[PDB]
Design a protein around this ligand. Structure first.
Ligand code: MG
Ligand code: MG
Ligand code: MG
Ligand code: MG
Lengths: 112, 48, 102, 154, 116, 49, 145
RNA sequence: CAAUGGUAGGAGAGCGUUCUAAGGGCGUUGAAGCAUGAUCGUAAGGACAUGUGGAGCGCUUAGAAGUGAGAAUGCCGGUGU
RNA sequence: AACUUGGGAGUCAGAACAUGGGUGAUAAGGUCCGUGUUCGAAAGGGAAACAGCCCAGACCACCAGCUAAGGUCCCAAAAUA
RNA sequence: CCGAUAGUGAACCAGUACCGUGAGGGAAAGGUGAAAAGCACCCCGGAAGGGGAGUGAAAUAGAACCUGAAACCGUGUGCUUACAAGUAGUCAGAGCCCGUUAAUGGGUGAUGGCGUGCCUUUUGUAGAAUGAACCGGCGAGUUACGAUUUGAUGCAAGGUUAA
């Protein structure tokens, strides 16, 4: 009834991916894929990938159909941040936090 | 020219109410049935 | 059928069949407490006791002698390092009226 | 703050930086710094007057003679070390799990026999100590040790 | 023997965070501000447990005053009349008598109007 | 007397006064030394006489 | 917390009342009307809910004034602009827009709380014998002097 | 029957943390921690139940202390705006 | 209550009002003394708000009662006495 | 006596990264499981990841691996909120949901009353005096010897040892 797919430590800031995941929340699988493939943002290819993984998992493990599949819920939360520095002026150094993201998507057949 | 105080979580989430991406202008393609952007050429088929 | 009694340091208006909460008394569970300080018996037959209405008593069964919920007294004075925390629990009684007199 | 490695340089200048004024990286507030007033090597022993030391041995031996825990035995006579036999003796004498056995002078075989019975300590009549009489719930004194302990402690 | 201050600071701070359950924003997740707000709350409560006694007193006054003027008589005269008559009913009990039993309130108003 | 029930002589022992631990003890902030001056400093005070 | 009645909106009944102003001084009418619509004459008064009645004032141009505040008693009002202060005397209000005169004298006698505004909205002042509120069935009310 | 605001400050009684001695106990049939809860005492605080957790830990009396943090433009580490 | 002896202190920046005086200008929320009070170290009611003014000293409840200073047409409890 | 912000600077390739021309200065960093049994195959993906199946007592024990708090970031929602002037609480209270360590119960709160954080320093601070972004850990009257005084305990014209 539910199928899971997760991408961990994706090299995109979670607040940047969340903008895109605020569109495919609760839409149908086909419409969701059409959005991702056409939204011109950076995170979009990495999330489309997760949707295909989720649908493949559903078909191959639960033998449920990929037409009545709505996106039960899809979110993204922080990951193991990488700390770097930028040489700024007058000998001072400022920090740069290269963040990451733990993308999760679950697709459901809307039943029990 | 520096923040005199913190911007609480309430104020933060409030300011970004209008900060969002719009769903693409997508319509279904007449030759293949896959979605395409309106006024653009379908990338799956290559039509109109 | 409707009367007003004076118990502890306060007054209460009562009609038989009700549960009430008053200061602690010295009677035990299940006993009967009778008040002799009645000041007004109203309703269909009104009796305006000057201090009290003479003769009218009010009898009620006693149950659940207990302690109120813990109010936590706290106070402090700023910039003085002075503060005090004390907990308190007033005792009380649950009384149920079962008869009235006139 | 004197025994922690290094820490001799004023970590930054006193004024101008916007930081708190610091003088060593080994000050007590610093991670890795000197301890203020902690443990120091010392002894803990004290002394009491001599007469008071004697009233304490007598008081412990009188508590263990009011509670009926003083069994005077005549002699001991163990001619070779054997533990199973010392357990038989203390059980036939009905002595509690914790007993203190007192010999006259050093009795090697009695000592080697009760070293492993868990709950039994063997002591000479001169080496009687309060902590030992007071832990022991029962005593077993040789008649010769009993006359020696009466002579010394009174 | 060293002793490390674990597992005591935790409980002490948590039983104030929990005691600030339901305060706006950052006042219900931080010890350093939750404690101040709880202190202030205790102070306010200690004052209000006194203020209540007088707020409800004047509530009963307003109700009795409204009730008396329906009988063409003012609160001051009403209370003076009951004092003369010897009646010792609280302001609270007059409030509920006026709300519930109009006939009885009228009757004791007359007994007070006649105690002039 | 048993080693697990012992009692010290009445009034013979007393817990010492720890200083500078909370306001409630009564010696909280200044540790009983007042506010300022030599008396309020470490190794302060004045030589006797 | 024993037994004091508290009015709530399932038991509040509000009535309508017309109070004529022909021959009644501003303050001595406005204070009484404010007491009315506050509900301080309801034996079932409650401070935290809007008990109290509706009020209509019909004439509102036959107001008289004591002393000579016909020319004095100037009302001021500011527009939050620099030097944005202009003023008007009481007589000019009484001849031009007399409804506002009474509607502003009474609302000054109520609190500024939210209940204050919702109570002041229970007032309808008209400047001439006729009122357009006959459907709410109003009852003449006399003033206790 | 009387007394009980309180700062510098004096006096007294106590609550808690680690360790030790002894006694008596609890623990894979689930310890310590952690989280939740509408529980108990005058306070410092003490329990109980349910989850996670996968091995130690309470209680009584008495001893010792690296024993209690919210501020030092404190130090270290995380994470904000 | 007071005094004596002994153990432990903190205090040596005061403030405003009223009243007797100096100084200044019968100036100052001035300054220096004397004599109260209060604040300091004092919450509560009044003075719109307002450490020092007026009234009054908070052990902890209570949806009881009486009053002081201030008050009683509305904001806002009490006299449109 | 310390149990990884402790105890050596260093429990771990440490006087090592690193810093400085050099004297010198100097870190951070332990913990899968009993056993490596360290995940055969299948599925999406270029891969990183993942989802099944299997190993194991346990895999939110999967190698960054025991427990896994708070700050902080999200996803749901029960109750609220778009005429209002708010040191954010308290006190009074309708409406709406829920039901316990069953006790005169829990969550939210229309609307009214009262109400300018905390510390330090001051005669006096809501102060626009100072101090703290926030969480966590660490972080300050101790010890040795001697003097004085009080309590306690010996025993007393005697008491007492030091090496
Ligand atoms: Mg450069
Ligand atoms: Mg400030
Ligand atoms: Mg400011
Ligand atoms: Mg600052």
């Amino acid at each position: 009834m539910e199928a899971k797919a997760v991408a961990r430590t994706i090299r995109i800031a979670p607040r940047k991916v969340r903008l895109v995941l605020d569109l495919i929340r609760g839409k149908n699988a086909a419409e969701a894929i059409a959005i991702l493939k056409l939204t011109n943002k950076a995170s979009s290819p990495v999330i489309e990938k997760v949707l295909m993984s989720a649908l493949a998992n559903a078909e191959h493990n639960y033998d449920m159909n990929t037409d009545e599949l709505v996106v039960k819920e899809a979110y993204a939360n922080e990951g193991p941040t990488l700390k770097r520095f930028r040489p700024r002026a007058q000998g001072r150094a400022s920090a740069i936090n290269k963040r990451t993201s733990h993308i999760t998507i679950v697709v459901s057949d809307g039943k029990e | 020219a520096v923040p005199k105080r913190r911007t609480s979580k309430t104020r933060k989430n409030k300011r970004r109410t209008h900060f969002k991406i719009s769903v693409p202008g997508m319509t279904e393609c007449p030759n293949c049935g896959e979605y395409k952007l309106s006024h653009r050429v379908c990338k799956n088929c290559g039509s109109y | 059928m409707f009367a007003i009694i004076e118990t502890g340091g306060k007054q209460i208006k009562v009609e038989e069949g009700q549960e009430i909460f008053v200061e602690k008394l010295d009677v035990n569970e299940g006993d009967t407490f009778t008040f002799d300080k009645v000041l007004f018996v109203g309703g269909d037959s009104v009796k305006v006791g000057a201090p009290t209405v003479e003769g009218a008593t009010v009898t009620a069964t006693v149950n659940k002698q207990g302690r109120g919920k813990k109010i936590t007294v706290f106070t402090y004075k700023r910039r003085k390092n002075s503060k005090r925390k004390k907990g308190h629990r007033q005792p009380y009684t649950k009384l149920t009226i079962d008869k009235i007199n006139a | 703050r004197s025994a922690v490695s290094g820490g001799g340089r004023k970590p930054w200048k006193q004024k101008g930086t916007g930081r708190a004024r610091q003088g060593t990286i080994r000050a007590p507030q610093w991670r890795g710094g000197g301890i203020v007033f902690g443990p120091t090597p010392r002894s803990y022993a004290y002394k009491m007057p001599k007469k008071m030391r004697r009233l304490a041995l007598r008081s412990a031996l009188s508590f263990k003679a009011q509670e009926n825990g003083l069994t005077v035995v005549d002699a001991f006579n163990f001619e070779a070390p054997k533990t199973k036999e010392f357990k038989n003796v203390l059980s036939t004498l009905e002595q509690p799990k914790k007993v203190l056995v007192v010999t006259e002078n050093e009795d090697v075989n009695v000592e080697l026999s009760a070293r492993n019975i868990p709950g039994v300590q063997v002591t000479t009549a001169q080496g009687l100590n309060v902590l030992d009489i007071t832990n022991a719930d029962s005593l077993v004194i040789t008649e010769a040790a009993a006359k020696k302990v009466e002579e010394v402690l009174g | 023997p060293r002793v490390k201050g674990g597992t005591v600071t935790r409980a002490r701070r948590k039983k104030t965070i929990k005691l600030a359950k339901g305060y706006f924003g950052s006042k219900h997740t931080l010890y350093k501000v939750a404690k101040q707000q709880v202190m202030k709350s205790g102070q306010y409560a200690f004052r209000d447990r006194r203020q209540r006694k007088r707020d409800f007193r004047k509530l009963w006054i307003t109700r009795i005053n409204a009730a008396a003027r329906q009988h063409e008589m003012s609160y001051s005269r009403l209370m003076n009349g009951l004092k003369k008559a010897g009646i010792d009913i609280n302001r609270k009990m007059l409030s509920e008598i006026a709300i519930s039993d109009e006939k009885a309130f009228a009757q004791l108003v007359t007994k007070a109007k006649d105690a002039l | 007397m048993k080693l697990h029930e012992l009692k010290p002589a009445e009034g013979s022992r007393k817990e010492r006064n720890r200083v500078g631990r909370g306001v409630a003890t009564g010696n909280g902030k200044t540790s009983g030394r007042g506010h300022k001056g030599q008396k309020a400093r470490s190794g302060g005070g004045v030589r006797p006489g | 917390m024993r037994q004091t009645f508290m009015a709530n909106e399932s038991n509040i009944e509000r009535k309508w009342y017309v109070i004529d102003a022909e021959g009644q001084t501003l303050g001595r009418l406005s204070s009484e009307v404010a007491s009315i619509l506050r509900g301080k004459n309801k034996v079932t008064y409650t401070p935290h809910v809007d008990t109290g009645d509706y009020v209509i004032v019909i004439n509102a141009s036959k107001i008289e004034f004591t002393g000579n505040k016909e020319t004095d008693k100037v009302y001021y009002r500011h527009s939050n602009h620099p030097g944005g202060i202009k003023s008007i005397t009481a007589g000019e209000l009484r001849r031009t827009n007399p409804e506002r005169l009474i509607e502003n004298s009474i609302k000054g006698m109520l609190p500024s709380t939210r209940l204050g505004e919702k109570q002041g909205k229970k007032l309808f002042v008209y400047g001439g014998a006729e009122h357009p509120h006959a459907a709410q069935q109003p009852e003449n009310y006399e003033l206790r002097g």
